[PDB]
Symmetry: D2
Subunit: 237 residues, 4 copies
């Protein structure tokens, strides 16, 4: 199977697989059962922001999710990614709906990664910034139900013509270039990701969530990953 | 055939196909017969720098090539790239040898492209910086004889174990992600490229040169392009 | 007197001093009588964007001014700034009202300047980005009637408590650090400025305009510069 | 007195004021007696690199100091700078010699700071990069014995004409613009600083060290701060 590291914005409490009893943000290391979570005051219909950071000095993956004028939610987990991910990866966004649903709309996404050489002390860097997504956005690999171009946005899951979100939908978008996320010979390394999102649901409760993720380069949506598995994992182990 | 825009650092004067009678830099628009050239006082065995810029306001492609403590060479050409290239391209470096030869070693390569939306005034941007090239550089597509990793450099053309450049060699490196180089609905767009290079000629008579180029995404080295055609064109038309 | 290079967004045609008979954008080199203008279809009460660029390879100062979903206005002028400005300058925004008036509200301002050494080929760079202006914005020198903090914006000219712009007002904001704008030993240099602005004219007859300018470091608002002189020049010569 | 936060590269063990018995890097919070140190394998005559980072999510100030091809030294300390520094500061480099001496040469210095608003989720940012220092570097405030321009470098302490370093010398360089280092209303904030240095000593042991520091805007070299106080503190409390 794929190797996954993710920061989840989980809108539905699946307490039977270890979720806390409230919408929450979490850090997922090779399992949908987050290693760490924080309660998230999710706001139906409002545009929010996610900020994710990691560096090789502290080796602490942290995320902050917030809405303008509200208090933020933050989660952190100590993890040495050199022991978890392959050296080269792809980065992406993933989202799902199940019995319950919501729009999983992405309005912007940026990423920056840097590796400073132990031998020369010079750096390699990659940076991308999407503020609009065209109908043919060739530097993204769309998987599942993901589409781009509608109102200039990236819709991770299925939305009908009438603007309503559909259930049992899974969609992901990965940046086309492989990313060198760690290197033994790098003296310092870091990455950061930011995205803005709009989750609206007409249901009695939204589901299932959005995640920023890092995976093997040939990662694909696992079988049976709609709903609570967020398009990320083949099971709930 | 491919669609090619390039800046050439031409170390060998092929006067039968329109080169001036001295080493020169040139702007090539869909032909190896440059639309504009400038004399280039090349310094064999010395590390040089090339800087290439263009923006959609001036629609002028300009390049500056030089070595530390020497006078620079500059060439410029007015051209509306929206009428020349496809909207989506790849960018790369190419070089060749022929009857005569030289090392075509790249020590660093950076690129930044940005497109600002007419409807939102927000920007999409891509940036990469290589200061070292590893043996498995997954974000580069190597073509022909190009290799990475020897001393952390990109060797565009074949170099023997003893360090001696070989003749009849052609090689290119392209960035893995497609690049959105122009857009009708972009109110302002720009790109910039920089690279550092070391052309060594152990017999003091080098050929054929290095180029930065922009092509259709699926471009391959054309048949018949070693030597004076720089790995870019199938003929001298 | 000061040494001023500016891009003006001139909302009021002063034909007795050489303005064209319509709102326009212009390039001003040591005189309020622009060296080049372009017609500007200004949209009162709408948020606009201005983009200014220059580099030492082309030696062309260009500006683009526009509003979302409208056609842009562009103006360009060839000028070697090494022969015009001092090596070290400050950069700023200026605006004025006179007999007639308008809000001259700035919502964002960014600038980037870079100088690449001829001897080392390494670069010095400065970058700042303001997306919000606080009540005590210590990295700005406010001159005249300019204030910061109301709604997080920079109000270059006087606005009353009821929100109504006042006449005979002049104000400027300059970045605190001096900027090295050109250097003889720099092989390549460039700058770029961007700002977003909101000019509201409650009586539909606005004056006088906003400018981005580059001046000697110790520049103050000239005596007699309210109104058509834009806070930049002591007279119309 | 001034308020100081610093990362020290301490080349001389003053065990009588709490230094460990070896050259070391440390984090100094309002006292020369570091809150945390790490042993530093300082290399006489070799060019090294320092990297300093902090963000408001983790609130952990960390530093990595290293030489090419050697193992790095790293030090980290949990500290909420909102409770230590004023909101607006200046940033700088400082160095000293005493009975024993060394060159305290700076070859490059860069800094980046960012503040994202809780109300709009937009960012303010400052970035500067010095790769050469001219004889008249107007965006630096030089204090004490600091000079710029010699071989394009910043010499923090006195160096004689013959290339030899002098004793009892103190010198600092601060960036001219005030920096907004924290803000209550910022949802996320971060800063990073990098510099390259050359410390050479002809003595039986080098002294006293180099520091990156953050202080009140009007900070000046304290009385009696040569030698072990690093030009930072008025005493050893
Ligand atoms: Ca869940
Ligand atoms: Ca040729
Ligand atoms: Ca006017
Ligand atoms: Ca000491
Ligand atoms: Mg958007
Ligand atoms: Mg290199
Ligand atoms: Mg703003
Ligand atoms: Mg230097
Ligand atoms: Mn969960
Ligand atoms: Mn040629
Ligand atoms: Mn005018
Ligand atoms: Mn110490």
């Amino acid at each position: 199977a794929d190797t996954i590291v993710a920061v989840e914005l989980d809108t539905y409490p699946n307490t039977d697989i270890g979720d806390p009893s409230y919408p929450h943000i979490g850090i997922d290391i090779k399992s949908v059962r987050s290693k760490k979570t924080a309660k998230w005051n999710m706001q139906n219909g409002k545009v929010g922001t996610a900020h994710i950071i990691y560096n090789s000095v502290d080796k602490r993956l942290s995320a902050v999710v917030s809405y303008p004028n509200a208090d933020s939610a933050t989660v952190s987990y100590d993890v040495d990614l050199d022991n978890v991910l392959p050296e080269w990866v792809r980065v992406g966004l993933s989202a799902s709906t199940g019995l319950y649903k919501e729009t999983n709309t992405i309005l912007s996404w940026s990423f920056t990664s840097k590796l400073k050489s132990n031998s020369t002390h010079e750096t390699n860097a990659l940076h991308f910034m999407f503020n609009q997504f065209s109908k043919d956005q060739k530097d993204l690999i769309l998987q599942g139900d993901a589409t781009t171009g509608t109102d200039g946005n990236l819709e991770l899951t299925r939305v009908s013509s009438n603007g309503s979100p559909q259930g049992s939908s899974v969609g992901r978008a990965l940046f086309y270039a492989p990313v060198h996320i760690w290197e033994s010979s790098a003296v310092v390394a870091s990455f950061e990701a930011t995205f803005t999102f709009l989750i609206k649901s007409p249901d009695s409760h939204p589901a299932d969530g959005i995640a920023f993720f890092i995976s093997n380069i040939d990662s694909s949506i696992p079988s049976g990953s709609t709903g609570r598995l967020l398009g990320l994992f083949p099971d709930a182990n």
